[PDB]
Design a protein around this ligand. Structure first.
Ligand SMILES: O=C(O)/C(O)=C/C(=O)c1c[nH]c2ccccc12
Ligand SMILES: O=C(O)/C(O)=C/C(=O)c1c[nH]c2ccccc12
Ligand SMILES: [Mg+2]
Ligand SMILES: [Mg+2]
Ligand SMILES: [Mg+2]
Ligand SMILES: [Mg+2]
Length: 716
């Protein structure tokens, strides 16, 4: 075969060559030392990794049996909690402590703003994401439904000046709200000059300054005639571009062309739930993009990474603001193996261990000058998001895994920082202990609420039928879970030190709703929350201007707003909650969601994209939504809500629907009418019917297997 032998390992040639020829040069790490380190880290940590997974199996088995020796319905909370305690699921809270993480960048410790997540396998999206640090507010307002397409203000093939005027007025009002004038309104401004180092705004009757002069951050061009004016509010920059000779500028009363918002302050380059990668060839594509990102030289077809932005300080001197979001990388979690490396017995190597070694190695390039200044962390950290951990022993393992990798890479200890996803129940209920296990590495906690819902369903699979998917977002457990996350963070001293993050808005086209509703996240003390696109980053940024996150977090200090009983309130459906037609649309909804996502995953290897749902609402969802949908259907089938023919009929009904929605594509092979000849259709069916039997309801084992099958089939 085509592998390279290194001690006990057999490494796929593509990955071996990539590491040697692309990743290693420039690092000063000796190739022989690196590979021997890989072999030794893998040898030392593999049995512990496996034991952690066995522990999940043991715990879930005990829970399944507890429910199966079932009473007559309502759960006895005191008994249940005592049970969780006795089996080591629910562990004691450690005493109060404060995190000690150092060498973290201001983007994480201090700045509250949007956090963008993007599939690393897509080079052009990853590039747009890195550049999303700065975004046009005019484009984001004009191009979405935040400005209502009413009579007269609708989007056409050419610019609609009536709609344009609304965009302008929306932005003026934002300016008045965020950086107030001493008197008057930006709506009445006729010009901007800089005089003796202070901003002067001409009104039609007089001139005025900012109510708070300190919000004047800089400018470009001559002071007497600046091309732009830079402001700051709540640590976020706003830049008024001034150009009377432009399409929009000629219409504006002050010659204003656009308002640019500092938007995606950080971006997560994703190797996990938003990509499909099932072998070395797939991993390498991802590693190569992550490499191009850190070196500054990634470029896509049809392009490049933005340079830093130049300004003149009011006081007088040239300075620079970052032109890119600070980049995290999301590694895969502890579950999966990947044949990119096998051992001598032919066993696949743990993929999470590989990601640490390789994304860790590659990240070193972002700590040094690109060939321009260094791309990423100026304070010397590597930021890794670690998803899907179950409890504090699993966090401690990641800690030791990073420590060992730091040794192999010749990096100082604690260089590799951890963004902890709070997205599994055993982590939620032991959160304080989970943070403590990462006390000198943690840079965020985040409520990954979609995965969290999946785990909620799987954990209590045998308890009874669960409420519908759309109901989950408002169940007591999840609300308690959101508050409990913030409390634990603030109490560990995250304020000023680490991000307290919240979850993804998935409805990419429903931007007016996002602007209206996602404001609840910073209001809840979240210093960050996830957005699916640069456009969504720009709009979510509005929320950080209206909400003083720092102040909100100070007010929340010391409070305990969720009990363990609330956390443990299983989302069981009640007596006769649904009519026949309600059950049927919930089934169709889920079968459509599964099919539309799985067909692109297995056939084209796309792990995330805009997928229209049943009512054609565009959704940017990923593997976690699949986890929920398959687990819910498995749960309804398990408890007799629906029959196996119900499931079949719905799959078979929804399948041509999906073929139609994707009739546009060219690599698309239709599932109907020969369903059993469709590897994707079979994968979809398997995720439901075998769903209850997947470890913690995870979808990767079925998905990886079927994608690999498809790839193999398309080669004979
Ligand atoms: O009485 C109780 O409340 C309680 O929980 C009893 C026990 O767990 C055990 C008693 N003998 C044992 C041997 C092995 C493992 C557990 C036990
Ligand atoms: O809630 C979770 O468990 C979680 O981790 C969220 C996600 O991964 C994403 C949800 N929609 C997305 C679109 C693009 C990239 C990532 C995502
Ligand atoms: Mg006992
Ligand atoms: Mg997740
Ligand atoms: Mg319901
Ligand atoms: Mg199981």
């Amino acid at each position: 075969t085509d592998r390279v032998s290194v001690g006990n390992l057999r490494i796929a040639r593509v990955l071996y060559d990539f590491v040697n020829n692309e990743a290693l040069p420039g690092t000063d790490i000796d190739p022989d030392s690196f590979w021997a380190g890989v072999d030794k880290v893998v040898a030392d940590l593999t049995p512990q990794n496996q034991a952690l997974l066995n522990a999940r199996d043991e715990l879930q088995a005990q829970i399944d049996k507890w429910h199966r020796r079932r009473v007559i319905e309502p759960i006895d909370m005191d008994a249940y909690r005592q049970f969780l305690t006795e089996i080591g699921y629910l562990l004691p809270e450690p005493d109060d402590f404060t995190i000690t993480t150092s060498g973290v960048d201001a983007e994480i410790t201090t700045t509250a703003g949007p956090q963008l997540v993007v599939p690393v396998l897509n080079a052009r999206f990853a590039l747009n994401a890195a550049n999303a640090r700065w975004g046009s507010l005019y484009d984001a307002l004009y191009g979405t439904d935040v400005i209502p397409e009413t009579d007269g203000a609708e989007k056409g093939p050419t610019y609609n000046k009536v709609r344009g005027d609304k965009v302008i007025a929306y932005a003026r009002k934002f300016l008045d709200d965020s950086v107030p004038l001493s008197s008057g309104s930006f709506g009445d401004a006729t010009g901007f000059t800089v005089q003796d180092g202070q901003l002067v705004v001409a009104l039609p009757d007089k001139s005025t300054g900012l109510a708070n002069p300190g919000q004047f951050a800089g400018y470009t061009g001559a002071a007497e005639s600046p091309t732009s004016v830079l402001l700051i509010n709540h640590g976020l920059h706003i830049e008024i571009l001034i150009d009377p000779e432009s399409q929009v500028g000629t219409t504006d009363r002050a010659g204003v062309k656009d308002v640019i918002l500092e938007s995606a302050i950080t971006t997560i380059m994703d190797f996990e739930d938003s990509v499909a990668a099932v072998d070395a060839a797939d991993k390498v594509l991802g590693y190569r993009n992550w490499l191009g990102l850190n070196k500054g030289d990634l470029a896509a077809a049809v392009r490049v990474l933005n340079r830093d932005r130049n300004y003149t300080a009011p006081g007088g001197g040239q300075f620079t603001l970052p032109g890119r979001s600070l980049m995290f990388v999301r590694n895969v979690g502890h579950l999966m193996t990947n044949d990119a490396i096998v051992d001598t017995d032919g066993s696949e190597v743990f993929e999470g261990i590989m990601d640490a070694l390789f994304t860790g190695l590659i990240a070193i390039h972002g700590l040094k000058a690109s060939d321009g200044p260094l791309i990423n962390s100026r304070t010397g950290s590597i930021y890794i998001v670690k998803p899907k951990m179950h409890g504090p022993a699993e966090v401690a393992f990641t800690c030791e895994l990073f420590s060992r990798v730091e040794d192999v890479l010749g990096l100082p200890q604690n260089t590799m920082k951890i963004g902890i996803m709070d997205e599994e129940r055993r982590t939620t209920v032991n959160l304080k202990a989970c943070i403590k296990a990462a006390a000198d590495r943690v840079v965020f906690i985040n409520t990954g609420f979609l995965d969290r819902t999946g785990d909620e369903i799987h954990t209590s699979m045998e308890a009874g039928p669960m409420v519908r998917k759309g109901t989950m977002k408002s169940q007591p457990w999840i609300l308690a879970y959101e508050d409990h996350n913030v409390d634990a963070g603030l109490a560990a001293g995250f304020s000023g030190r680490a991000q307290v993050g919240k979850g993804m808005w998935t409805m990419t086209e429903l931007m007016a709703d996002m602007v209206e509703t996602k404001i609840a996240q910073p209001r809840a003390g979240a210093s960050t929350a996830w957005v699916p696109s640069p456009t969504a980053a720009t709009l979510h940024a509005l929320h950080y201007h209206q909400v003083d996150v720092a102040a909100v977090q100070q007010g929340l200090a010391g409070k305990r707003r969720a009990t363990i009983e609330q956390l443990l309130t299983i989302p069981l459906a009640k007596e006769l909650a649904w009519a026949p037609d309600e059950i049927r649309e919930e089934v169709d909804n889920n079968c459509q969601s599964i099919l539309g996502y799985v067909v692109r995953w297995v056939d084209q290897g796309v792990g995330a994209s805009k997928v229209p749902d049943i009512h054609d609402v565009a959704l940017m969802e990923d593997r976690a939504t699949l986890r929920i949908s398959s687990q819910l259907l498995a749960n309804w089938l398990r408890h007799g809500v629906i029959t196996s023919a119900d499931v079949r009929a719905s799959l078979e009904r929804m399948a041509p629907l999906v073929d139609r929605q994707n009739a546009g594509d060219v690599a698309y092979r239709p599932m109907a009418p020969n369903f059993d000849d469709s590897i994707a259709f079979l994968a979809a069916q398997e995720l439901i019917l075998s769903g209850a039997q997947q470890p913690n309801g995870y979808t990767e084992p079925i998905l990886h297997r079927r994608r690999r099958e498809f790839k193999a089939r398309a080669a004979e």
